[model samples]
Target: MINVSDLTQKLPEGSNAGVIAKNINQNQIIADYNGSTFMLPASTQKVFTAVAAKLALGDQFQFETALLSNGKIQNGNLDGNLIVSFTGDPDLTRGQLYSLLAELKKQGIKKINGDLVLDTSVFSSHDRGLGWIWNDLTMCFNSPPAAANIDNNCFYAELDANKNPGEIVKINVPAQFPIQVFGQVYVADSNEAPYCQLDVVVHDNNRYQVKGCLARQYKPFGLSFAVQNTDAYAAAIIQRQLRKLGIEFNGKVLLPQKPQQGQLLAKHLSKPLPDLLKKMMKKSDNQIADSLFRAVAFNYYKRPASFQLGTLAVKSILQKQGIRFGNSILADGSGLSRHNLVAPKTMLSVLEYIAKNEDKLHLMETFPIAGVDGTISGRGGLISPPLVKNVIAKTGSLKGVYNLAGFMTNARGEKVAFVQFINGYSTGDLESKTKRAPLVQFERNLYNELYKY
Candidate 1:
């Protein structure tokens, strides 16, 4: 037994909690608490999405981002327009884009007589997930999973304030950065002051106006703002890189266009599905999770991927595997949406599936070890004792919600799968004392007892 009652009795009065632990080898339940009730599972929802992607796309699946040309290449020159077809790679980086373009320059092709056309037609214009909170739109984690997404559809800038308080701060951005960022942040005495918050406002053409306050600190404060307009961002970078490379692009920089029957010039392939799943599960990468979600739908439906299709595809894929999510709301793969609802039992079943298919899935090695790498590291006192490096799991959190689901080895050296979902947990005065909060304490106690199980 996990002493679930004793561990949870100290939680906030209105906090809703659920748990289900089972021995994987014997297929027996070790404990259950409100396991059948639906709750917001947060990023813990990612595990199901990961499983669906692996099963649907296969372990060796890789996204092919290609560069094509409708025109022929002659001695140090090109006769036609350059076309780029991006496959919505979650790990696509700006450096990769530069290298792809540099391949053109390296091939002794100095002049492009035609225009630069980008092909993002395979992805629907609606990139945002349904039921996502509006306030999180500017945050990097909530960046839309656009087809041409680069650098995770995220932009970075720094705000520095070395002068007196209430004075406007300076914004510093990379010179090669495609976007133009304007900052109106005022310096504050301290970051801990009430209402001293930072807000990012996205504008047209991938331009941004950052409105917020930064404390007078010695170092510059950094911000990771989500890129709202992926098409424009892509276009700008392509044009800029071409100019820098002296490729002589005479044609206009086109947007959202594709060419038929073009010859391949260069290409980039994302890491295989298993490696990507490790990144998604361990780091809780929202961009990768959402991209894989849409990718599964793209491959399953053979159409341009959208959040609606992704939602359906996930359910259908799991159903084919004999796993069902009845009455559960799966709004997005990243679990950044407020509309997601899942039961502990449902999540436990996912763990069960991973356990049974361990030979094929090889997913146990991907989870984060408590007090070790990934998101679970430095989680209160878990990093110090028997809990550290023993508990391996995927953590999910969104404001009042905290969730975990994965495998752990018990004292008997038996593999056990568990799911823990805590929602509507308000620390109030205990927020500052995070280490001593009821939620934190509960996790420590529960895992301690579970280790003895």
Candidate 2:
């Protein structure tokens, strides 16, 4: 048998490592490798967050967005302003909006007589939940979750070029908008000079600064970018769609505090929590995690959502489950922030609890499987056909941290739980693929050895 202590010594030095292994049926730790210490688990933290949500919110919870108006609708005309209130619906899309509009049309609402109001008071200002990073604030990936976000609060645009050697460049916005294009595409031969630079800036009064440079033409097509600001994006798209629908509005888009108290014109509910959680955890979606975190705050406290409150709720849930951890800090549920920490024992305990409980299948389904699907797909060499599939686990990676945690079945069909965390490695200094190799090998080696026992 291999010496677990020697294996631990073989790990990269100057970094913290944690491991905890236990049998599926007996819940006994067969091997311990620094399992009591805390370490950064990166995205693997989502396993706990997702499991907490599944237990607290129930598997059937569905996020809902509603359209309410206080004014009277007479002869297909609204007498007062129309308000669209949101509860942080992250999956709102153009098709969903169109369906809402169709419902509005059924209510004899041919035109909104007053201004379009968006009430985002359910969550505190979108800026608060974002982590403490100045540069991340400006990027779309770090976009804040608002009450009213259409299309995941982003816009996708694809750039293309004409076949003519020196023709003008073409810009294609997937969703219609009212923004203006001010740049020109210089022509080039062989369709290889039309590179594009896309910038999406949020300005005062909900205006946008969409300025960027584009190549005249090139092979492999043009670049694609995602712009955040769903409320503004929806407003822009609605304005354009309304014009096409022959409805004209003289008022501008503005934010409101509450829903107008009168009639509810339409309401759209997202997929059940089980479905959303699958996507959120499988993809490690930051936006969905943030939205759900805040939603929990709103649901429990009747106040705008915040990460602090969300983390409190998560901790409370864990405490209720009798789970304990030492020297752990949870700043955000998404784990994108650097402030989060956890001991491998805590993670293993949670996994053991879930593995023993039949009701925790919802939580188990959210993890990525080795070599099958989710974040682990195309990740490690050990992830190949017929070997790693059905190995449900969560993976985490950051600048200096890498982790894998979850449950797997041994060759004897006994369930096993494990967590391997590596921190303080310079992820950028080394090729990501090269760095991932060792971690993958470590996980596979650990799993194989456990199964043999």
Candidate 3:
């Protein structure tokens, strides 16, 4: 038997927590403290998204991107435009995009006399989710999801940084993705404190204000940030890659109408759905989760996809699986949105199906092992000899919030599903916000307690 009160006691004073566990093999509830109450699940929300995704897209589904030429290929010169119509591929890296450019180079194409069109109309440009912290928009973790997610729709601010002990450090956006870039970085003695800060100036035509300090030992440094306009940012990356391949473009990169109506030039295929889902769940990638959520909408409606439809699509999938949750009530696919909420038992129902599914092994492999790979890798109690690798789960957190939910092999050697949502914990007045104590230590305690069962 487990004392649920012992776990909730770990929460901050005046805070609340909930749990729901079941022996799927026996079809019985093991613990159900506050299981029916709504609590913010944070990134644990991906567990729910993963369930609908497995159903909506199937095991072997693939995400695709096609490069088309609107004009004829005459004597190594395209008299028309080049359009890239892509699905929501979150891992589309600079290396992969360069491969497509290399293909264009192979055909001896010199110049595109017309525009470079980005036919990313498969999904809408509805950026950001409900209840997203407004300030977080400029951070890397909160980058808006996109169909052409080149470099995850972000860039790095590097310090070319030639500096003296007392001089300011210089910086640049390596490719100069945008026209303007500046930073106010200073240098200090090796014994001085090291520091850095990236200030985004989004509404002001995508400008920036960076501040930092580097030690005398290291001259150059780097930082990452989400781009202002992801589509434009992607176009810039493509154009830069083309220049390297000696392929010249004559016009701007614009999203044109009916971009599929063109000559076939090149196409890039994404990894299979299972593989991509591995990255999403293992890494708790906010962008990938949201992209798949929108893809679910597209998969069901067969047209333009939006967050609005995504909520409904995922709901329909969950309901069919005999697990009713959210009721089309989620704010975003990644659970990055603070407005999102779910009952502990709600997630338990979904996990029950996952444990008994034909694809259980592959799906469980995606979860972070107690002391192994992914986010929860090498965690507290997870390091204990018997507890290590015995628990497989997704970990979640935000200011004053923490959650862990997934499949675990119990002491009896039977597979079971479990959930823990510790939310609404706080410690400061509006004037002085800070870390809420003992939660991480407490979460680690839960893993130790449950593995005993």
Candidate 4:
């Protein structure tokens, strides 16, 4: 028999590693595949969050946002204040909000006596988590989660060249459907062709921040600012929509003091948990994962959502399933926080569990198939030739970390769970695209070896 240890010794050493699994049904290790060590799993961390949420929230779970009024409704009009309370609905859109307003009008609510209030207290004040590097915070990929975010809770300002000579450029806000752009834009001619800067500063109150920039067309620019003020932005959009609907409010647009235990009003429901999970995993959406993690925490802990609570719940779930690991750390569900650490074995084990579970076919169905799609689509496609088509997996990458974890089906039709991680690479000296090719080649080689075995 080919000894597993002998085979593993031939493979190059990864920065850190581990793997644990028996055959599909038998409880015996077929290969160590790096069992019990730690590595950075990057976006692959989303797999755990997706699976946990699917099991906890169920495939049919939907989030809700409600329009509540403190007073009675007279002739379809709210006699008092209208409070828009957010319940962690990530899919909340301007069209949906407009529909709700139309429904309110249909119910005889022509005017609201009180001001437009947005209750965002469902999430805590510190929207951005600790341990996140300041450099990444300004990028859209690193946006924070909140109770009332719309359009990923951000606005886009696009700059294009003006048709006329001597005119530097023209700037426009592309998405006016839900958000309001209150910032100014300037075009300048300089050695830096396209340079732009955006800043969001929360003045004494959480209500408003300034977001504007000056840019030269087609030049590299550094964009820096506070995390998007999601709650305030949502409230502002709602206020704008109300005005468009011919509804006038005497009070200022503000966030609700806190969420009270009250009856449900008009609740806006989100898509099923399964669908959201697919998006979160496929796109590696940090905000969605964080929001779902917090929701899980709130459901179980009866309090506001937090990273600590979320991580505890994840670890507990894995433990209950008989999966154990050393040096595995989970600080946030989105894996954006550098505090997260895990071993290749831990990831392989999880993939093995899903491979064996009948209910987990859906989970497998959601993974990115090699050469066809996902974060590794381009890289895998280039290296896969025409032989491997449906090898599904997850990809993770950060400044210094690169990881790929999932199952590979051998030529014998037997599935082999594998996790490969590479960390500590210098982002400055190495070209990611060039460096990525060898990793893909390694995975392809591993699969070929598995087939031969």
Better of 1 and 4 by TM-score: 1
In terms of lDDT, the poorest run of 10 residues in model 1 is 427-436
lDDT score for residue 180 of model 2: 36
Candidate 2's residue-wise lDDT over 11-57, tens digit each?
A: 55565677778877765677787778777777777766776767776
* Candidate achieving higher lDDT, 1 or 2: 1
Q: Stretches of candidate 3 above 4 Å error?
A: 159-169, 176-179, 183-198, 211-220, 257-260, 326-328, 359-361, 427-437
What tens digits encode model 4's per-residue C-alpha lDDT throughout 126-194?
666556777555466776777776666645545554333234345444445333334444454453334
Pairs with steric clashes in candidate 2: 92-151, 191-218, 192-218, 194-215, 194-216, 194-217, 195-215
Off by over 4 Å in 2: 1-15, 127-132, 137-140, 159-217, 220-228, 258-260, 325-327, 384-387, 427-435
TM-score of each: 0.93, 0.83, 0.89, 0.82
lDDT of each: 0.83, 0.68, 0.77, 0.64
Q: Relative to the unseen true structure, what is the C-alpha lDDT of residue 143 in candidate 4, on a scale of 0 to 100?
A: 67
Q: Quote model 4's TM-score.
A: 0.82
Best by TM-score: 1
Clashes per candidate, residues 3 or more apart or on different chains: 0, 7, 0, 13
